[PDB]
Structures are given as C-alpha cells and as structure tokens.
Amino acid sequence: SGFRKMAFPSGKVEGCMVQVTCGTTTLNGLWLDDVVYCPRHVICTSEDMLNPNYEDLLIRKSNHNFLVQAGNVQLRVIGHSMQNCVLKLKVDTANPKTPKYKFVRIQPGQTFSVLACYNGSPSGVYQCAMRPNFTIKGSFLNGSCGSVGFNIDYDCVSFCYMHHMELPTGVHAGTDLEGNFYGPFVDRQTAQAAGTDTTITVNVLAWLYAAVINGDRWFLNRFTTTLNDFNLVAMKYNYEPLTQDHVDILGPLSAQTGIAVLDMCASLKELLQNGMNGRTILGSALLEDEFTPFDVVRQCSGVT
Amino acid sequence: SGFRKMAFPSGKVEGCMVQVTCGTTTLNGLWLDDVVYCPRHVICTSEDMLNPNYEDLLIRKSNHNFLVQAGNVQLRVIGHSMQNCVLKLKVDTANPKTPKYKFVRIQPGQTFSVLACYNGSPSGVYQCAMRPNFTIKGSFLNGSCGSVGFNIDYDCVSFCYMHHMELPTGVHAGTDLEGNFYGPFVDRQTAQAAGTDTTITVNVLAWLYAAVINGDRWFLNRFTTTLNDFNLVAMKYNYEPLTQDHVDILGPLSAQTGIAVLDMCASLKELLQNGMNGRTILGSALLEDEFTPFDVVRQCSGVT
Numbered sequence A, B: 001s002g003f004r005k006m007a008f009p010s011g012k013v014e015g016c017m018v019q020v021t022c023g024t025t026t027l028n029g030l031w032l033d034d035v036v037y038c039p040r041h042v043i044c045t046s047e048d049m050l051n052p053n054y055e056d057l058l059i060r061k062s063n064h065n066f067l068v069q070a071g072n073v074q075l076r077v078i079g080h081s082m083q084n085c086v087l088k089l090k091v092d093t094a095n096p097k098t099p100k101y102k103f104v105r106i107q108p109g110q111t112f113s114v115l116a117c118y119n120g121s122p123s124g125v126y127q128c129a130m131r132p133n134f135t136i137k138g139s140f141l142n143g144s145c146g147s148v149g150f151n152i153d154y155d156c157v158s159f160c161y162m163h164h165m166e167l168p169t170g171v172h173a174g175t176d177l178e179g180n181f182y183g184p185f186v187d188r189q190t191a192q193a194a195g196t197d198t199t200i201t202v203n204v205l206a207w208l209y210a211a212v213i214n215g216d217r218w219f220l221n222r223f224t225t226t227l228n229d230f231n232l233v234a235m236k237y238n239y240e241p242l243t244q245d246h247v248d249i250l251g252p253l254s255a256q257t258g259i260a261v262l263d264m265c266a267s268l269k270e271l272l273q274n275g276m277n278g279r280t281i282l283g284s285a286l287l288e289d290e291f292t293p294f295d296v297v298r299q300c301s302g303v304t
C-alpha cells in the first residue's frame, strides 16, 4: 500500500545520454544505435536565438563541428541532418547500451518520466504530464536541453519528449523525438505564452480511485451524475471535458473498487464545489492530475 | 526553473537488484561484490511471521535453500549469515555492475530515492524521507521487500534503507544495510504503532527557499521571529523543533535569496497560523517537507 508519484527506473536512458558541443554551446543528446538526437539550437549563439534561420546557420557547420562525448570518450560524427527542431548526428559507433525503443508523440494528459541531465550526465528523474496547453512543468536549468521524457513498456523505452525551451513563465516546451514541438512553440528567444493550464480530469479520477484503493475514502459521497452535468461543473473549474473514452479507460479501476465512474465523477464534483476543507487525499491538499489510469493500475499491481 | 520532487537516477541500483527465493517466499536482494543482502524474513512462512525465532528457523536452511537469480541466471550461494534483520548471502561471483558504495544509517528528515522492485526487477523510482517517527510513506506491494533506499554522491551510492514491513496503518518500516530497523519496529506480524508523524521543519524552510528561488513569493511576510518564539508555534503545529544546526544548514539558501533564516521562519509561522487561503507554493496546497536543504541546493544548481 501507499501511492507515490513514481518515475520509471532511468538506467536504460542513462545509458543513452551524451554531451553535444557545437562551438561554445553544450547540451545533452540521446544516443540510440549510431545516431545522436539533440536540439538543433545547439548550433546557435544566444545572439542567433533572437531570430535564427537554422538552415542558414547549419550551412556553416560540418560533421567535425559537432563534438559528441559519451562518458569521457569522443564519438566520431560521420553524418548530420536536421529533422524539424532536432539534429540527428550519425556517429561511427552504435551505442552498445541502446535499449529496445520507439519514438511516440503523446497526447495532452499523458504522463512520462524525465531524466534531467547536464553535460550528458543524469542529475535526477521525475514524473511529468504533457499539460493540456502542451507545456510541461519540469525542473530544468541551463544545459538541461536534450534531456528526454519516456515511458517503459517492460523492456521497450518509448521516448516521447526532448527538452528545448523555458517560456517566460518558467514552464517548459519541447519536441517529440522527430523534432516536432508539442503545442505552437518555436525554438526562438521570443515571448511565447501558454494557453489555459486545465486540470486533466480523467487523471484526477484515476488518482481518486488510487486513493480509495489505499484507504483514503472520506471524500466518497452518496451522489452520482451524468457526463453532461459533470462537464458543466468541469468547464466552470477549468477541468478538461470528460469523454466516454475517459470513462472506458477508468473501467478497470471502477471494477476493482465497485465505484461506478459517474459516482466518482459526482464525488469530484462535490470536491470542486466544497473544496478539501483542510483535509488531504494521498497526502495532497489539492487534486492530483499527473497519474493516468494506466499509471494507477501499473503502480497498484506492481508491473516491472 | 521549476522545482520537482526528484529521485536519483536509478541505473547504478538497477544493476544490483536480484530475486531471492527461500522455500515459497520470493523477495528482492541487493547484490554488491560477492554478497547478496535481503530481509531475513525470506526464510519465513507467514505462519512463521506470527512469532519467528530467526536463529532457530535459520538452522533448517543451507546455502542451497537460498535461490538467487540475477536476470535469468542463478548465482551459486557458497555462504550465508544473519546480521541483525538482514541475510548476507555469499555468492561465487562478484556483481560486475557493483557501483562504488557505502552503507549509511540516515537521521529522521533525511531524504532518499527508493527503487521499488518485484522478483528482483525494478518497477519504479520515487523520493522519500525517513519520518521523525522512523517510518517512511512508501509505495510497496507484496514482493517489494528487499527494495532499497539510496542517495548518490557523484559515483558513490550510499544505501540507507531496505524495505521490510508495512505497519497496519499502511506506512512502511525497514532497516539500514546492517539490518538494524529505523525506529522500534521488529520483523514480526504483530500490531506495531508509529509515533507522531511530525513535519520536518528544516525541510519545509528549504522548500520555501526553493519556492522563492523559482518565483513563488506571495507568502514572504514583513515579520521575523526567534528560534524560541518560532518553536512555540512549531510545537503547537506538530512541526519538529528547529535548532541552530538547521539554521546553519539553511545558510546557503539564506545567502542566495537574501532572506535571513529567522525571517523565513516568521513567514512559515504565518503560513501555519493563517493557512494557504486556497493558494499554492510550487504547485502544492500544503507545506512540503521531503526536500532537504542539500536537495534544494543540488536541484537548484544541477549537480550530476
């Protein structure tokens, strides 16, 4: 028992982290097979960052301008291309610790682990969600760019995120591993504002299930509701709308607890309308939305 | 910027996790050099757990009754001893992935990362504190016993915890890696109650510093206080007393923010007396106490 904000074990991703240096700029890359993936702004002076033309800036760069270091050994770059906002550096050595992997583009509400790195060395691991405004609320200092987000399915690392940017509000933006930004963000030192940071309703419901499963039951009410009635209250509280797809996904938690999804919805509705009254659920004073239904099931069943 | 509950990268500890089976009981062990460390109750039937005499139960066990599996390869046990509540199984093979390590017994308030494992396989990593009642609030199902807590100083894993027990309240108890329980707990299926779970005051202060550093400043008040005046309010709120040793340790955060420690104490005092009024600090509605001053400095400076 107990329920913790839990990241994947990071070992498989630690074995992929390299330092990439172009001129004076150093950040992290992800070495998978004979390719190193890094943010393309590695080629930029922070003067360049104000209005970079990456294609033009790239003409000035050769294979040998990209310095790739894995531990304290340099990799030979024999190839470089730009894919969207990432650089793929072909190296002459396949990463011997390459895990089985996929590149996946996740949806808002999806959670993943970040291995925060500096000079290609891991400093820490935490669990995140893609916000409904396609930002993440990370922990990232200068040099953290190239750090990646991932899920693990048994032995397969699904890489879903690469860190690129801190917005003026101190929330984070980045790309999938094909270099396409989540949201409308661009790799340019220009004021860019996030949209409404809504609560991930399906993730709150999952976590209310995790709470019941772990003995925290004080908030279970005697009410039910409908998706439409629930959604009127959701909209009012900047909660994301709940779909039959969200209800479907919560079914297994519904089964294990004997609490119908719409009953748990009615409990959430009262928690929105009444607040916590100084109480806590799983040692939180606010409703947590960075556990997916899959996360709750995984942690509640001990998947490895 | 941003501030996350952050675990150490787990890779160095993943490379140490084995499955230990004695009779029908399977849990996790920690393989360091040619020794596997596991909870001694691995020898117990849950019938044995009601009033075990471990010395007597151990007489009945030989080297070959302890089945140690690392990945899908069996290690040969050539030796076994009991040290307090752990078994040390001598194996004929040094763990080739043994990191540099220390065994350390941590103080209440000290944080560490848990790699939660099942059948010697890692399922997840989270950050904990030793509570002032020498419990931890973990996430641990059946088979999680032998999972370890650790800190990393650059390349040196300090192992501080091994999971042994869930108390009837669903909080956790375990040993240092010399097999001595944190607190008054024993490895027996007998009702054992935790003492008062106090807030780790020095850790709250650290986290208020982390908040200011990351732009959350609304709670900074115009007051200061004294350790004695602060401690009268602390005692009243089941906060641990604050010592000049806690103040000393906060000095670097004091320096970086220009907020005297006793001024931050007075801000905390008002937050206790006034509550949050529905506001949040670093996306929490309650005062976080599982970041040490060292943790805040580490994450705020990007140590690897």
Ligand SMILES: *CC(=O)N1CCO[C@@H](c2ccc(F)cc2)C1
Binding pocket: A025, A027, A041, A049, A141, A142, A143, A144, A145, A146, A163, A164, A165, A166, A187, A188, A189, A190
């Ligand atoms: C994340 C990171 O390491 N850095 C340092 C180099 O680039 C910085 C940057 C990114 C985007 C941008 F628009 C300006 C600066 C962030």
Ligand SMILES: *CC(=O)N1CCO[C@@H](c2ccc(F)cc2)C1
Binding pocket: B025, B027, B041, B049, B141, B142, B143, B144, B145, B146, B163, B164, B165, B166, B187, B188, B189, B190
């Ligand atoms: C933690 C774990 O895996 N287990 C399974 C086997 O032993 C269980 C146990 C420990 C202590 C106790 F007093 C009773 C049962 C916990």
